[PDB]
Assembly symmetry: C2
Homo-oligomer: 172 residues x 2
């Protein structure tokens, strides 16, 4: 995959004004990330969760369903953020399954990549890898797969950098 800086006036999830976007962000990020969204507040329907993840739970299924069925949303953005405390390091005792399982799988699946980086760069790669895995897994849901096959849904990944105050799209 590659990282492309967003231009706020041409974002892939706002090819036209006045539509709502489901924005999946992290609980230890904050409102600064939406300043990099290219979206006005009235176009943001935000689900803010542990590690900007969607897992196999009632909350994630009902939120996606409301967005697709009630709001007729055609764009989802999964926004990770550098410096995340959840998508970081090797372990966190207070983080339950399946959130902890998803991170453990990224750490094992990408052990070669992660081992070639040190500390801070390693956490940054985990944030990017989590965004890519969340986007891929959300496309593989029965409800998203049907919508994608009709060309009525796009799912996008980006990472917000609080140091540059910029978002970066994951192209891959």
């Amino acid at each position: 995959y590659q990282l492309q800086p967003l231009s706020l006036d041409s974002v892939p999830w706002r090819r036209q004004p006045g539509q709502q976007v489901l924005w999946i962000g992290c609980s230890d990020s904050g409102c600064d990330e939406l300043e990099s969204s290219g979206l006005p507040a009235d176009e943001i329907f935000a689900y803010r969760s542990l590690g900007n993840m969607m897992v196999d739970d009632l909350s994630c299924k009902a939120t996606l369903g409301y967005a697709l069925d009630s709001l007729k949303i055609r764009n989802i953005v999964i926004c990770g953020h550098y410096g995340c405390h959840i998508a970081s390091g090797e372990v966190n005792a207070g983080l339950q399954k399946p959130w902890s399982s998803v991170l453990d799988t990224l750490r094992s699946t990408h052990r070669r990549t992660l081992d070639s980086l040190t500390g801070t760069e390693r956490d940054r790669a985990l944030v990017e890898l989590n965004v890519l895995e969340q986007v891929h897994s959300l496309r593989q849901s029965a409800e998203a797969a049907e919508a994608l096959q009709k060309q009525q849904l796009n799912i996008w990944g980006m990472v917000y950098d609080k140091a540059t105050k910029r978002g970066y799209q994951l192209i891959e």
Copy 2:
């Protein structure tokens, strides 16, 4: 309950700086509400969900658990917002259980209060009643109940008014 305007310089969930607060807000609200929180961004750990509800699922349990166990959070705020589409009299077909069941139960449990009220007033009451019920329910979570018994947790309710850019605490 009664409604009390917030004083930004003396909020119940910030009797001291530099602690994190778990902020439970609604997906169809937005970042404007945190301008009325009395909290700087660095002190906000935000779960943003359908109807600012916590339902009995893995996401509620894990989010609360992480906040109590990993972040050692001593304050929770449930923030409703006037104009909410979810906590309203409009019953949308695409809202799943148990969110739809919580609202059904509010409408029946508070039928006396609600039945004397026209649309706009009824919807503002339903926003306030949802916040109160969410605060009451969350104190009966086993993890919250243990912390309250040690005087190591407070759960607070408020409602944000986008029109006036003001918050109101629910005083029980």
